[PDB]
Amino acid sequence: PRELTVIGKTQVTPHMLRITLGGAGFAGFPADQESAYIKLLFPQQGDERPLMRTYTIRQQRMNEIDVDFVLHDTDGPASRWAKSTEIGDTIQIGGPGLKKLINLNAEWFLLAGDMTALPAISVNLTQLPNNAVGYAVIEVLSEADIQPLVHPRNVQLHWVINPEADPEGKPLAERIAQLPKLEGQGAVWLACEFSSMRALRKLLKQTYDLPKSHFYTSSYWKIGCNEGEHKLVKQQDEQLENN
Amino acid sequence: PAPRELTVIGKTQVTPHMLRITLGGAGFAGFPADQESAYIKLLFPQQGDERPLMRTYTIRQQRMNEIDVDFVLHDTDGPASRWAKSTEIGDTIQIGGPGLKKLINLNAEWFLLAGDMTALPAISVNLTQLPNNAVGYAVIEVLSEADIQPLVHPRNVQLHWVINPEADPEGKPLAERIAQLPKLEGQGAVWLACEFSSMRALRKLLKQTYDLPKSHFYTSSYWKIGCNEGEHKLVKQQDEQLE
Ligand SMILES: Cc1cc2nc3c(=O)[nH]c(=O)nc-3n(C[C@H](O)[C@H](O)[C@H](O)COP(=O)(O)OP(=O)(O)OC[C@H]3O[C@@H](n4cnc5c(N)ncnc54)[C@H](O)[C@@H]3O)c2cc1C
Ligand SMILES: Cc1cc2nc3c(=O)[nH]c(=O)nc-3n(C[C@H](O)[C@H](O)[C@H](O)COP(=O)(O)OP(=O)(O)OC[C@H]3O[C@@H](n4cnc5c(N)ncnc54)[C@H](O)[C@@H]3O)c2cc1C
């Protein structure tokens, strides 16, 4: 696995901390992997297997990537590492995985997620055509966490300010259910906390009934679960769904 | 009662002359629940020692941590309509309220709602509170056919749209439409709000047609031609006393 060096830190917003990774270990990293996922490896005391955490490549340059960390409640190893790490420190990473961008063969676009998906949504918005139409709906912890995102003028940005994730999964789904319905062939991309993902998925299956080719949904974390516990819930739900 | 500072977190052009602004954030904490169709006051600060100007708007929709307010993009901009067009996500505004909501009386066999675009938000909310088997009319005066909206409503509450590009100082359009509707049989409830002169014409008509108790007969002037809201408040208070 690759060893990258911390060469910068940027407080993007109060709860979003961006780490730049590069150095000699970056050599050979595949080009143009923005929005692809990587795995951060955290060594464990007394265990040869690392703990692993999934993050998005927010930006990529010739010899560097940026990774954006939500400074979430209830630190885990990854959010602790992001706050504590110092320039010059190194971290092993695996990946990148396959990019899962929104389908561009569509007349309108609906993107939604919470702050764990804001990096990927940011990248997707830069890949939409300039004449694109639709919505990007993002749940953030505070108004200060709103970002000035690049986006097509007619893809309307909507921010939902929710200081604590809702186990009932309402805030994003309630906002989107109360937006006008989009007409034409659409593409949907959403990722957020597990319960909000299910609520959005249910709502959007009912509103638009889109094929899987144009309907990406993913749970990125779950309240009360560290990432290992989350992967199980997620696989069970994606199977129960697909079946 | 110190005003709440809310952040603009979304904008949606509902129709060409109806612009919906979503407001929320930390200033929303504690906001009373279930206040759709209640009024709020927007504050526009003035130069120097001057107290701010205040404008009255309706809570169109309410969610966990935000409200939507629908602005008519009316002829002859005032501070509120100019503000709605120019404001950007991230901007803030102070609000007062909510006031007491005045929903149509539900103890009735039929329902008649009427108003112009300043009343379309409250009428929309009222239509969602009626029982599904409700019978009657909702008659709305809009500036153009494009300002007609696909409102949720009981199937047997019939929507009627009056298309009038400029308000009538004699107050004829809504009244002439409603005077020619079949008369409803049974115990009724009426709710109407529009430009002052049309309000007077409708109140007179429906007092004569149905002569309902005040418990079941709501009328309100929401604005007046040639008057800013301060000038309007005086006329409205004088007319409410005469009654
Ligand atoms: C494909 C993919 C891409 C992702 N990209 C990013 C990214 O770019 N940036 C990012 O910040 N996250 C991203 N995530 C989410 C990230 O993997 C999880 O948030 C992970 O749980 C964080 O690891 P951790 O060590 O801090 O917490 P863990 O040890 O996994 O969990 C500790 C505790 O924190 C809670 N918790 C975890 N995440 C959050 C959160 N966001 N809000 C509130 N509580 C939380 C857990 O429920 C648990 O209680 C991505 C997830 C996936 C599946
Ligand atoms: C209880 C209540 C609820 C209301 N809810 C809403 C609401 O949800 N949405 C909404 O748009 N309005 C609503 N109104 C009406 C709103 O208060 C007035 O339209 C207000 O005058 C607009 O403020 P302004 O600063 O733009 O104009 P002002 O500075 O008050 O007036 C400027 C000029 O514009 C004219 N004008 C004002 N409104 C209109 C109009 N609708 N059409 C044409 N000319 C107009 C005035 O006559 C004046 O010449 C409500 C009124 C009341 C009493």
Author numbering:
A (entry chain B): 6 to 248
B (entry chain A): 4 to 246
Copy out sentences from the published article reporting this entry, exactly as the authors wrote them.
Shewanella species produce hydroxamate-type siderophores and iron removal from these compounds can occur in the cytoplasm via Fe(III)–siderophore reduction mediated by siderophore-interacting proteins (SIPs). SIPs contain stably attached flavins and use NADH and/or NADPH as reducing agents. As a result, these two enzyme families are considered to have a redundant role: reducing ferric iron complexed with siderophores to its ferrous form, which decreases the complex’s affinity and facilitates iron release. Here, we present the functional characterization and structure determination of a novel SIP from S. bicestrii (SbSIP) and show that it is an NAD(P)H–siderophore oxidoreductase.
The structure of SbSIP was determined at 1.9 Å resolution. The structure revealed two domains as previously described for other SIPs: a N-terminal or NAD(P)H binding domain and a C-terminal or FAD binding domain. The NAD(P)H binding domain consists of the typical β1–α1–β2 Rossmann fold architecture composed of a manifold of β-antiparallel-strands (β1–β6) and two short α-helices (α1 and ƞ1). The FAD isoalloxazine ring shows a planar conformation and is stabilized through aromatic stacking interactions with Tyr-60 and Tyr-225, and hydrogen bonds with residues Thr-61 (backbone O and N), Tyr-59 (side chain OH), Val-75 (backbone N), and Asp-73 (backbone O). The negatively charged phosphate groups of FAD are also stabilized through hydrogen bonds with Thr-60 (backbone N), Glu-232 (backbone N), His-77 (side chain Nε2), Gly-81 (backbone N), Ser-84 (Side chain OH), and Ala-83 (backbone N). As previously observed for SpSIP, Lys-44 forms a ridge with Lys-236, making the access to the FAD cofactor smaller when compared to SfSIP. However, the pocket of SbSIP is substantially smaller when compared to SfSIP. However, the access pocket to the FAD cofactor is smaller than in the case of SfSIP and likely sets the preference for NADH via steric clash with the 2′ phosphate group of NADPH.
